[PDB]
Amino acid sequence: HWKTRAVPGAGTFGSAVAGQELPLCGVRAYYPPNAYIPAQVRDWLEFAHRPGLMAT
Amino acid sequence: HWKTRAVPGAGTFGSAVAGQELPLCGVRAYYPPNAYIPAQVRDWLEFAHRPGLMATVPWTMADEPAERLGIFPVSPSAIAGTGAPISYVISLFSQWRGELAAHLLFTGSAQHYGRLVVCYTPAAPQPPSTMQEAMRGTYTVWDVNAASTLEFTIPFISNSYWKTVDVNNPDALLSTTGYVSIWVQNPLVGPHTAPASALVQAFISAGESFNVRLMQNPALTSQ
Amino acid sequence: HWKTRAVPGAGTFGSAVAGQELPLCGVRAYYPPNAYIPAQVRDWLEFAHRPGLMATVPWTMADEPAERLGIFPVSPSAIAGTGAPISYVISLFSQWRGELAAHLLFTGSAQHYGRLVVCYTPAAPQPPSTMQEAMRGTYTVWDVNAASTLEFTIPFISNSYWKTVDVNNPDALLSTTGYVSIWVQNPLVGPHTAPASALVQAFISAGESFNVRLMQNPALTSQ
Amino acid sequence: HWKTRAVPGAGTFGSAVAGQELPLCGVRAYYPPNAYIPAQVRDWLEFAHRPGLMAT
Amino acid sequence: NNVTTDVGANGWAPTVSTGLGDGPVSASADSLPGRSGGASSEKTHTVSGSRFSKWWEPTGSTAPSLLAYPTATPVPLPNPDEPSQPGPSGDRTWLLDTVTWSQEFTRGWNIAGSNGMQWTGLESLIFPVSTDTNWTSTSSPTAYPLPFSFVRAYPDSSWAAMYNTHSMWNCGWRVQVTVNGSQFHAGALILYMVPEATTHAIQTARDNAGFVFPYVILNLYESNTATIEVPYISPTPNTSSGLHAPWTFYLQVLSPLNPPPSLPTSLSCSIYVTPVDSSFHGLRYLAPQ
Amino acid sequence: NNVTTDVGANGWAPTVSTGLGDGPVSASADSLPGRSGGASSEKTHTVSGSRFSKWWEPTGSTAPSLLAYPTATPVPLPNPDEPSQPGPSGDRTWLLDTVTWSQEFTRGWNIAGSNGMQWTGLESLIFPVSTDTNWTSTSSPTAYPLPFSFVRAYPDSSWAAMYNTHSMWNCGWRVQVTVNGSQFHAGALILYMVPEATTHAIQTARDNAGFVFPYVILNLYESNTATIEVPYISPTPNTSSGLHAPWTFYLQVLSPLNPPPSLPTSLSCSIYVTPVDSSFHGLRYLAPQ
Amino acid sequence: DYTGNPLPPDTKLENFFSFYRLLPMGGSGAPSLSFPADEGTIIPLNPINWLKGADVSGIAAMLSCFTYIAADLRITLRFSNPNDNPATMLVAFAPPGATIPLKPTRQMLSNFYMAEVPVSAATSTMVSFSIPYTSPLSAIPTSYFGWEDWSGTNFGQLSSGSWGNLMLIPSLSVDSAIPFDFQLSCWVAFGNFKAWVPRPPPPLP
Amino acid sequence: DYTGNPLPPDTKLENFFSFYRLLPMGGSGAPSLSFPADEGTIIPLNPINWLKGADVSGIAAMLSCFTYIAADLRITLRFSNPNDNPATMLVAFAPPGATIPLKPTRQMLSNFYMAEVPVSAATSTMVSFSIPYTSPLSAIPTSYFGWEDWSGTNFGQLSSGSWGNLMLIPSLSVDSAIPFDFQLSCWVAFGNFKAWVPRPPPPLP
């Protein structure tokens, strides 16, 4: 067996921490084709590039 | 699954232990450019290399030969409480070694003449009482009218490799290296209507072999 | 994350278990040079190789032939309580083996003459009662007027590979190897006005094949 | 530090499970020579091959 | 060893930051394009060498006279505008102030004249700093905050002209003081350049450890003048005008003036100031200090 | 195997000391430059072969007669000063003391004369050791502490001259004793050299296990003299003068003197002392022991 | 070669400041801070706020030897729980320059990078955090001669010149009749510690 | 070749002293030491202090067979808690030669290399520590014939000749009406054990 020791902060949930999730679905899922949908956004700055009225 | 077993000391916080922190910030940060800022320090010994006044020793024309003007032991009772930058670095740590650079700046007049002998005597049960007894150690007879400052090296004539910085036991074998003292060799002389006194500013800083290790609680609880 | 499961014995402290310690000192230490110190010991058997007095056996001119001067069993009841350095190393451990080197130093006069037969008999239910019965084992007739000390080897004529160091059961098959005894072969003689007695100092130390293993609580609770 | 999670059955003792023991003897032992002892058995079927009376 | 902690070391790609184990997170150097500024003396500012698709698009003193710190390396600036430089009309040695040095002054006595300001760190500075109550006090002034004291001394200089017209500036500073005493005079002054002068920093500059700061000593035994120069410092590459004093000058007494008998009990001092390599960014309307 | 513990083994770089797992920390050998000293006999001291940037800069006895331990290797010294050596005037065989050995003395009886000191470990030593109350006692003296007894016996020797003038010293020691008995005499003495003599150490030297310490036996059966020599020992490379006794000599009785009838009931003994390869560091004023 | 004698560490600011030291709590430089279980507390990660505040040996006193500093903050919090029931602490990281909410709620703190620490009953629980250098300034100043805002209301402060603010909210599953207060203790360490423009050490006795 | 029979270990001082043994507590060589929960205690890591102190089998008795020793200390502490509430122990390492504070406080002990051990209720908790050879001497002497200081006040002692001192401070989240005392038990082991100048073994019955 390995020997171990817990550092301070055991059982703590972090929004920025990865690898906390356990599988709640057993089988490998396959999403239906979605390449027909246009206007795919990937960045918040693209919203900022769109025009927006500020003062009349 | 792996099998495991906890060793004694679970959930213990250590100042010297690494890998305890968990990320409290998700994104990768980028610090703004800081290469325009000069005077970047990286070591505590650089503070010790900077000059630091320790004693303002006066010197008058009335002072006769073999007159003591100052004396201090080279122990954590003195070297750690001078007020110089080096004294602060010494008090942070528990052990020190290497040479100490003393600088006696003569702030008198350009018309004054005389000599002050600076003596360094290694460790002994009793400090030197007279000038000639102090001149039996490593000394330098300094003529004040030459260059402004005297470059007196305090050699590390020590019993062990390291000296302890313990203010409670300064006179220990593994703590003090000896005494450094200033005596009047030739009386201060100068023309009439010249100042009858002349101050000598004593600076102390770290030599090129000066080191310190084993950090301790600063401030100290002293006395 | 890894999956884990604790085996029986969590949080248990073991003297023989490694990797339990956590760092209570942050910085890397450098020990001062220590190559100037001589007599560096690395093994417990080196203590056993040093001489150690076990019995001060007297010998007078009045002692007749076939007179017993001393006898001791080669068992943890005796070999572990002689006061010699080897006896301390034996008591630390539970098993021993190999040869034992005995040294009988004749501290008499240079005018004395005579013989003392040193006998080693292997294990038996009863010790030897007479000189001739003891001389049926491994013996050496030692003439005292030659070299000062006699080099008597106690051979490891043993039943098993190791002998147990148990003071509660010294006469066991797996504990004792036998008896070693000193008898007067030829009576002590010398000129008139010479000393009527002569002391023989019996030393004991480890042979070149002597070993010990399996550490036990020292001191012992004996008796 | 590693992240971990205990599966059901923590602290359970198994006769068929390996790697449960911790060292209760520090030094490396050396057993005395035993090649002089004959009739070394290694299998339970060797007992079964020996004769055995069943009915008179 | 490599102490028992973990300074970095760092990681990447999934080494020191994965879903199985973690060490302490570290920030990387931001590689930016822009005009090279920040570090004075070595300005030489020039051009440098969107990256995402859209959804709608297809020993010491008074030995020599050198800079207290060595000049650092330039950095790319965040602003794109080209700076305005006063040149020789601005970067020059100005007579900052003339002050008296009497023998009554003791160890650690800060000396300043009419153009100086009383600043021990405890004074309540009424905004803006140009308010007269800041410069006129019941006691004698002590410091020379740069550029506040320099701009007040010469409000019509080309340096102050751009200073009141640009939001940010960048330059080094050189201070020199001339004190003429005869060969029969004795005493020593210290020329301190204190960065970000505050209550604790100014009082430690009076004390024994003050020689950690940039310093030169004006010892009457050998010298009649002493010069000291410092490069630019700040938390930002360019300092905000009228709202930040990176450097402050302090002329304090180490050894009290010891004049010969039957002579005056005070000597006159002349303090000079020199801005080194000046650039000004962000031109707009006139807003004085 | 490799026992079940972990002696070291050690680690580095991030092997046995990382942010994922730890073993026991170990100290490394300090590689120092300096003058080669510490180990006596092999002195031959000579020169050896800042490293950070600043912010402001750009069987046994009485068989033969050999050393009780073999001489060890030299080490670099922390102090830079060149040592002062007494030479043949210092390193020589001195008559330490003359003492009587009577038959009344039993097993483990420590013998010492006028120059010796009563030291069983229980005596309250008044500082400094040169105080007369330490050497004069109600009972007979027992030990010869080195160099305390040697310096007291000859206070005017060149060895003692430097000893009272230097803060630290370094040398080995050789002790010899001559006891002449006729062929009709019997008895045995043991010449012990006890390191760091304290209450428990001195009493165990009287007992059976004392032969772990350096020893030679002076058996009247064959010998009239016995010599023993020991190299230098200490927790530091150089021993502090007047405040530390590394070695102490003990001449005790193994077999009580057994003289022939009608002859004297005691024999005279002459104890000699020899400092081997002496060096003295740190010259200053005269401070005796 | 070197030889070497590789000058021992402990002299290097990268190594010296990697170790943890007790952070003085804002106000008087107290070793602990007491906050009620009803609202919680907000502890700023600002050097200037830590060196109110000329101490003696306090880590603040060591940081006051440098004008500007830039490092990756390591912080360990300790929540002392007085009552007999277990609790849970919600620690969220407000970046330097972010708007700090007036009433810290569970929903709003969840949008920041937060952590949910289980606190044990009748004892203190410890947890360690790592925050990189997120300040918009090039280097965080320990001392500042000027005003934070153009109006000149706050003198000698830079709220953005910090590692940010840590917002705390206690949570209880059981209902207690008497409102109790938590005790907070902080330790701080620094990774990749860089310092500029040295300052004189603080005085002592 | 060897053959070999590779002489069993247990004879080697590097192996023999790697195992843990119960350290005698300073004073009478007691197996345990009792200290109040109000101030704590300071346990010196000094051989001479351990061998006050001629014992029988005590690890001290084994160390008294050598004049000088040099090794990396391994120490395991046990804190026996009598009362019904959990606690936390603050163990800090004072290096050999360091000034030991008169009143041990949480703030001052945090500047040394410290550890914060959670202690369970109504039972003892164990924790193991590793300290390298930090003594300024070349080798730590078990016996010493001389004076520690030039004044000659302390005979037969060298405070620096040790692995240092361990400073303990108990901490409680709950308030107890009756002041109670902790019981302390120590185990010690040695890494890279080196010994010089052998000494005779201690006597027995």
Numbering used by the authors:
A (entry chain c), D (entry chain c): 1 to 56
B (entry chain c), C (entry chain c): 1 to 223
E (entry chain b), F (entry chain b): 12 to 60, 67 to 75, 140 to 370
G (entry chain a), H (entry chain a): 31 to 235
Text from the published report:
Unlike most picornaviruses, kobuvirus capsids are composed of only three types of subunits: VP0, VP1, and VP3.
The structure of the empty particle differs from that of the native virion, mostly in the contacts between the pentamers of capsid protein protomers. In the native AiV-1 virion, the interpentamer contacts are mediated by strand β2 of VP0, which interacts with β-strand F of VP3. As a consequence, the interpentamer interface is reduced from 2,750 to 1,400 Å2. At the same time, residues 55 to 60 of VP0 became structured in the empty AiV-1 particle and residues 67 to 75 retain the same structure as in the native virions.
